[PDB]
Structure formats: C-alpha cells, structure tokens
From a paper:
The ribose-binding proteins are members of the periplasmic binding protein (PBP) superfamily whose members play roles in prokaryotic ABC transport, chemotaxis, and intercellular communication systems. The PBP fold consists of two domains each of which adopts a three-layered α/β/α sandwich motif. The two domains are linked by two or three β-strands that form a flexible hinge which permits the domains of the protein to bend towards each other in response to ligand binding at the interface between the two domains. Here we report the high-resolution X-ray crystallographic structure of a ribose binding protein (tteRBP) from the hyperthermophilic bacterium [name] (optimal growth temp ~80°C).
The tteRBP crystal structure was solved to 1.9 Å resolution by molecular replacement using the ribose-bound form of ecRBP as the search model. The asymmetric unit contains 346 water molecules and two tteRBP molecules (residues 40–313) in essentially identical conformations (0.12 Å RMSD of backbone atoms) complexed with ribose. The tteRBP structure adopts the overall fold and topology that is characteristic of periplasmic ribose-binding proteins. The apparent thermal transition midpoint (appTm) of 102°C in the absence of GdCl was determined by linear extrapolation of a series of melting point determinations carried out at different GdCl concentrations. tteRBP is therefore significantly more stable than the mesophilic ecRBP (appTmvalue is 56°C). The appTm value of the ribose complex in the absence of GdCl is 114°C; the appTm value for ecRBP under equivalent conditions is 72°C. Analysis of main-chain and side-chain geometry of the aligned structures indicates there are few differences in the main-chain geometries of ecRBP and tteRBP (0.4 Å RMSD of 235/271 Cα positions and 0.65 Å RMSD of 270/271 Cα positions and distance between aligned Cα positions range from 0.03–3.1 Å over 270 Cα positions). The loops and turns in the binding pocket retain near-identical conformations. Polar amino acids, non-polar amino acids, waters, and the hydrogen-bonding interactions are identical in both tteRBP and ecRBP sugar-binding pockets. A bias is observed for a gain of polar and charged amino acids on the surface of tteRBP (net of twelve charged and three polar substitutions), while the opposite is observed for the tteRBP core, where there is a bias for the loss of polar amino acids (seven net substitutions). The comparative analysis presented here shows that the substitutions responsible for conferring thermal stability on tteRBP are encoded in side-chain identity and location (core, boundary or surface) which serves to alter surface polarity/charge, removal of unsatisfied core hydrogen bonds and increase in core/boundary side-chain hydrophobicity.
Author numbering: 2 to 275
Amino acid sequence: KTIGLVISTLNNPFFVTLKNGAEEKAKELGYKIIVEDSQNDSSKELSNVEDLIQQKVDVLLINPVDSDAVVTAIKEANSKNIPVITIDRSANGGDVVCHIASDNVKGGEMAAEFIAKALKGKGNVVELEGIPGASAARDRGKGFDEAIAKYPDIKIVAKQAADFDRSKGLSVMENILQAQPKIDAVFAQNDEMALGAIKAIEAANRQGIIVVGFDGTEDALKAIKEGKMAATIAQQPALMGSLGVEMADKYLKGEKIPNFIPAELKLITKENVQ
Ligand SMILES: O[C@@H]1[C@H](O)[C@H](O)CO[C@H]1O
C-alpha cells in the first residue's frame, strides 16, 4: 500500500519538514510514499495528482495550491475512489475525509496581540500577506485585523502580498520601506517572507522594527536568537504530515475518523526559543 503526497512547494522549509513528518510515519506504519512538488502551480498540481492516480495510490494527501482550483484534482480523485485528506490548507469543494491544519485565525490573533503589547498599543504596522489562494493566508489576515482593530492607535500602513516567498518578501518590503518612513512593526504571514523583509530592512539601515513571522522554521528561530526577528508563531509541520498518514491508515482500515484535526500553535520569542 502506497500514499501520494502532493505539496504546494518544496522551496519552503516549512513544507520540507511536513514532507519529512509524513515520510517518517509512513515507514513506521509500513507504507510506501510518493511525494510530488506542485511548484505553487495548480497545473503542476493536477498533473501530479493524475500521475499518482495512475500509479494506483491508495490514499491522497494534498496541500492545495489554491482553495478553488484544487477541487478539480480532488474530484478526479473522488471519481477513481481514492480518499483525499487535505493538510495545512483547505479545499473549497470535492469530497475530503479529513482536514489537518493550524487554527490560522487564532495564529493571526496571536501575532497581533504580541505586536500591540510590544508597541504599547501605538504605532505603524506593515503586514506582508501570503498567497491569497491559501486558506492559511486569508485566515491569518482576518485574525490579525480582528485583534489589531481593538487598538485604535495602531495603524496598518501597508498590506501587500508577497506569496509566502523570501525573494518577493524582500522586494515588497523594499517598496514599502521607500513609501513609509515610519514603520514600527512588521507581521509576515510566514517566516520566509519575514526573513526577506529583514534583509530589506537591514539593507535600508532601518532600526527599529519589530518583525514577527509565522511557522517556527529553523531560519526564523536563528533570526530570533540573533535578535533580527522579535517573534514567530510556531506551527507543527512534521505533526501535520504525521497525522495525515495516521488518518489515512485508519480510514483505509474501515475506521471512521474526525473530519478536522487542529494542530496547535505556540508564540516563540527570545525568552522561550528553543
Ligand atoms: O502554513 C503554511 C506555512 O505558513 C508556509 O510557510 C506557507 O503556507 C502555509 O499554508
């Protein structure tokens, strides 16, 4: 028996960890696993899924590139009676037997609360959004807005997408720095964007700025120890991958499973890094 793992991109350390979590548990339970990289492209994702259907995989674990666009691939999986579990990001359609992810609205709230307290409830905040087609991104923005709105002297002065990517985080932060001489904090919706923003800030010789990421990647934790990043909202990618395989196993054994499993989040600062 064989599991198909379709991941949005392997250019993000977060997803490399998720991949490794799935692989470790698959060995443990005696499953083969085929991991395929969608390269943030819904077309590559569909071709990846079709390859896996043709290899006769017994279950499909998918981390969608886009909430709507993924439904075609899921509905092809459905037609061939291959069970689908979504991981980290939700699908807006098709039959999905389980979804495993963080409470990303709560994660955005956590980031906002930290920033608002750290800034004594006053200042200019920049938000670097992730891929808009990812539930994770949308949810973090919603939670962040909901929490920061309670602090009227905090103004979100720029809100721009940087596609969960380090390079785009740099370039976007460059532009924002040029357009905004007063920035007191930055929330990036993932660590890769946060690291890119840091590079832009250090390049511009800005001081000065409390940078908060999302994920708890090794590079982020190192940035925090070095004092380049103030905090991150740590996720459990390896556990998400592990649970995905676990629930696949149970489902394949004829057992009913919950249809949603939340993965816990933890705020990480210098005080508790590591
Ligand atoms: O949860 C994940 C991670 O934050 C990753 O860095 C980007 O994609 C999101 O869905």
